[PDB]
């Protein structure tokens, strides 16, 4: 724990806050919330404020469905760009059946649910330490995004100087005050694609931060009059934005993946995570890569992975094993992207990893020789299977896979699937402009 | 050192610092940096920061690889400009492989590596008084550079517009605010061309205070309303900016090239350094004049060294022993241009300098006047040879020379070639507007 009630009421009073958002994340990642006047705070912290439950199912929701709203006393965070009528603050609230039971179908709880298996399984903390990249567009007078990059930058370059620009700064330094912890940052590979990195934390505390982040960027990026966008592969033929995910299974304040006395100094345990994850690679792809565009981001070349294989030195692999050991021995999974619902990506990544540690699987052999010099049919001879080519070729793998269907419950697995074939189906019955640049003059 | 861990911090503290740019230098010589908030100054200087080192290899990177960034505590500075939610400092760093060993791929280390080559031999100090020119193009109503020149002034002229007249001033009075030991400024021949000439120093202090220099000369240049382009031959028709390097070996703490009672008061050691330098001249051009444009700079007339001979008096000699003796004795390699890598440059020169020293090489005839006035065939027979003409006739001459390998070591070397080779080949396949004016309507 961190803040007790009298600690929150001490700041509402002192710091003087007049409004309180009660955040919670839905099924498609949209960060939603009901909003209560500071006048109601009491009733809230007693866990009594209620809302239409179906709002989480997203668009495929169907019935008013009363849900109560427990505020994680600790998440409390007061925004600074607010003044004017009192300040504003937010409690990320877990969800609870009208008879006080957790709501099986809320992303966030489901993670606490799967990390239950994790402590039921002997482990102490399953640490995420994300690398969320992004893009910035220059708003139009009508205050609307455009296809205009905020800069013509490149890799780690001295992106827009100390002079006037660097939204990264206003973006970075801002996050400082709010209690964040930024590793570093640097301009990324494509013109106006920047990257910020925090320090690691248990999945709960972290996926809460990817959400908060996405807020603070999008809202700080606007003060600067520039569109921010975590979309996956916004432009065609330009670096996609990805959400590199760094996983470290501990046990006894001790990094389990570590084993000096061994090969790569990876614990046999760490081989179980890495192997088990390679199995359902293409299965949970649909989730960590939940959108239609992710697949225009999953093209060979732009440094974005496609093929299921692991190493520590190879271009665009699916699982990467960073070089630093000791406490920092971690299994980076590079297929994820910002579109991905944090709580949902972790649930499937961990569970897919926690499969390997309870049926003790066998890592297949790292690919260092290279797959991008091999052909599709050649890599196929070994444990190398391409990733899907669509949110659709993927859904057929996330459905088929009985274990993911155990990371997302009969409820969440259903409505995630419910929703993504109306998505995919919305995008396949359309008649895009390329289809005119191809078939109107010729045919 | 000049700052100690306790020196810095305190300075940070009293200076309300909030943003630190751990900056380095790639293989293309373009200034890169990973940027942290002051809250990480600690992990910074504990050499515990990390980054994707394959970002030094320019656009030819292949497999992201975790490097450590140790900061040289002496190359710390607090930019006068930033200060806008705090001030904005920096540090220049060495790049370390994971296992506490240097990165044989750092242009800065490669240099502390070739200097280590030096002390082995007996010398202690390599020093660099440099002569870097830069144009100043007027900017327009959109903020982008145009091809208008800041002023009409010639060689050493007086007041030419206050945009230069007080730019070489605002730069200079400014450059001073950051421990710059700048000798004398003056206007250079081609309209717009400028020159800031600064007190000589250690190779490392030198190519460092040089990188420093461009960042700065481009900001105060932009704050004043124009583009400060360091491009070799920005404009055909006119003179080019060039980066003459003034070499001088010390040892015992005495000038090694000075020789009271000898031929041109030039110590034998001096003639080797001068004879060797002449040998690889057409090999290390690749590194010293590293761009397609560089060789359009080395055209007839416009004072540029086109051949390869030494003189203390000549239109365009490839080296130059300047007047003064005493501690001041030194070699001027007029060849180099601001584009080249402050690091890889020094690296190659200092290595063809030492070659001539460890191996006792015979320097060819001090060319007096017969050359330029000469013809390109009778000029062959003489210890004089043309310098390449294209950045390729340049690469060839560099791959064939086995001491330039040793100079850059396989990693900078191999990747440097693979890269320019692509640079060149991008320029080649491209149909330039020139080809159309001449060939569009004629044939």
């Amino acid at each position: 724990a961190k803040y007790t009630r009298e600690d929150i009421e001490k700041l509402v009073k002192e710091e003087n806050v007049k409004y309180i958002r009660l955040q919670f994340t839905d099924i498609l990642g949209t960060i939603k919330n009901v909003e209560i006047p500071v006048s109601q705070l009491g009733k809230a912290l007693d866990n009594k404020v209620m809302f239409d439950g179906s709002s989480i199912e997203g668009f495929v929701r169907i019935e008013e469905s009363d849900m109560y709203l427990y505020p994680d006393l600790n998440t409390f965070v007061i925004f600074p760009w607010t003044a004017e009528k009192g300040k504003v603050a937010r409690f990320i609230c877990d969800i609870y059946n009208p008879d006080g039971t957790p709501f099986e179908g809320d992303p966030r709880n489901n993670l606490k649910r799967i990390l239950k298996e994790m402590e039921d399984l002997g482990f102490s903390d399953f640490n995420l330490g994300p690398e969320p990249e992004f893009f910035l567009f220059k708003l139009d007078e009508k205050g609307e995004p455009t296809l205009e990059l905020n800069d013509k930058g490149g890799y780690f370059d001295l992106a827009p100087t100390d002079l006037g620009e660097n939204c990264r700064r206003d973006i970075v330094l801002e996050l400082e005050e709010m209690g964040f912890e930024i590793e570093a940052s640097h301009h990324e590979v494509a013109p106006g694609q920047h990257e910020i990195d925090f320090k690691y934390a248990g999945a709960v505390r972290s996926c809460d931060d990817i959400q908060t982040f996405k807020l603070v960027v999008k809202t700080i990026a606007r003060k600067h009059g520039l569109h921010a966008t975590f979309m996956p592969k916004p432009l065609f033929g330009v670096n996609g934005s990805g959400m590199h995910c760094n996983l470290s299974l501990f046990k006894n304040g001790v990094n389990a993946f570590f084993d000096e006395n061994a090969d790569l100094q990876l614990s046999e345990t760490a081989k179980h995570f890495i192997a088990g994850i390679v199995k359902h690679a293409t299965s949970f792809t649909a989730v960590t890569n939940p959108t239609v565009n992710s697949y225009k981001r999953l093209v060979p070349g732009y440094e974005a992975p496609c093929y299921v294989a692991w190493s520590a030195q190879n271009r665009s692999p699916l699982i990467r094993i960073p070089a630093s050991r000791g406490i920092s021995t971690r299994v980076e999974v590079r297929s994820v992207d910002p579109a991905a619902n944090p709580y949902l990506a972790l649930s499937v990544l961990l569970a897919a990893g926690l499969d390997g540690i309870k049926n003790k699987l066998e890592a297949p052999a790292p690919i260092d020789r290279n797959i991008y010099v091999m052909s599709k049919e050649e890599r196929m001879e070994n444990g190398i299977v391409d990733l899907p080519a669509t949110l659709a070729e993927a859904l057929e793998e996330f459905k088929s896979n009985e274990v993911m269907v155990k990371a997302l419950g009969e409820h969440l697995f259903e409505h995630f699937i419910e929703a993504k074939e109306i998505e995919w189906d919305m995008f396949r019955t359309q008649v895009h402009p390329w289809e005119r640049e191809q078939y109107m003059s010729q045919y | 050192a000049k700052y100690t861990r306790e020196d810095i911090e305190k300075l940070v503290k009293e200076e309300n610092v909030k943003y630190i740019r751990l900056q380095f230098t790639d293989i293309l010589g373009t200034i890169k940096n990973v940027e942290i908030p002051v809250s990480q100054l600690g992990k910074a200087l504990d050499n515990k920061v990390m980054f994707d080192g394959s970002s030094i290899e320019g656009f030819v990177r292949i497999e992201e690889s975790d490097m450590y960034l140790y900061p040289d505590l002496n190359t710390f500075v607090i930019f006068p400009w930033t200060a806008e939610k705090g001030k904005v400092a920096r540090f220049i760093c060495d790049i370390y492989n994971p296992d506490g060993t240097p990165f044989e791929g750092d242009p800065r280390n490669n240099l502390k590596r070739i200097l280590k080559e030096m002390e082995d031999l007996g010398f202690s100090d390599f020093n660099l008084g440099p002569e870097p020119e830069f144009f100043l193009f007027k900017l327009d109503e959109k903020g982008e550079p145009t091809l208008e020149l800041n002023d009409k002034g010639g060689y050493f002229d007086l007041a030419p517009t206050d945009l230069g007249e007080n730019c070489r001033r605002d730069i200079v009075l400014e450059l001073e605010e950051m421990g710059f030991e700048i000798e004398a400024s003056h206007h250079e021949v081609a309209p717009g061309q400028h020159e800031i000439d600064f007190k000589y120093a250690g190779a490392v202090r030198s190519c460092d205070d040089i990188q420093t220099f461009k960042l700065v000369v481009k900001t105060i240049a932009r704050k004043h309303g124009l583009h400060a382009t360091f491009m070799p031959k920005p404009l055909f028709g006119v003179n080019g900016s060039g980066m003459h390097c003034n070499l001088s070996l010390f040892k015992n703490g005495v000038n090694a090239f000075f020789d009271e009672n000898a031929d041109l008061q030039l110590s034998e050691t001096a003639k080797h350094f001068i004879a060797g330098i002449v040998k690889h001249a057409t090999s290390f051009t690749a590194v010293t004049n590293p761009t397609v444009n560089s060789y359009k700079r080395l055209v007839p007339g416009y004072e540029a060294p086109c051949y390869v001979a030494w003189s203390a008096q000549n239109r365009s000699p490839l080296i130059r022993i300047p007047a003064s003796r005493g501690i001041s004795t030194r070699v001027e390699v007029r060849s180099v241009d601001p584009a080249a890598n402050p690091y890889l440059a020094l690296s190659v020169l200092l290595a063809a300098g030492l070659d001539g020293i460890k191996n006792k090489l015979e320097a060819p005839a001090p060319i007096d006047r017969n050359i330029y006035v000469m013809s390109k065939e009778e000029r062959m027979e003489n210890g004089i040879v043309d310098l390449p003409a294209t950045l390729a006739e340049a690469l060839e001459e560099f791959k064939s020379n086995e001491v330039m390998v040793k100079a850059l070591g396989e990693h900078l070397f191999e990747h440097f070639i693979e890269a320019k080779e692509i640079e060149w080949d991008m320029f080649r396949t491209q149909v330039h507007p020139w080809e159309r004016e001449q060939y569009m309507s004629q044939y």
Binding site: A190, P300, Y372 | -
Partner: peptide, 15 residues
């Protein structure tokens, strides 16, 4: 396949 993406990689660099 690294020639498409390195190829985009160089399309950002050389433009």
């Amino acid at each position: 396949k690294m020639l498409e993406g390195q190829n985009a990689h160089f399309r950002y660099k050389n433009r």
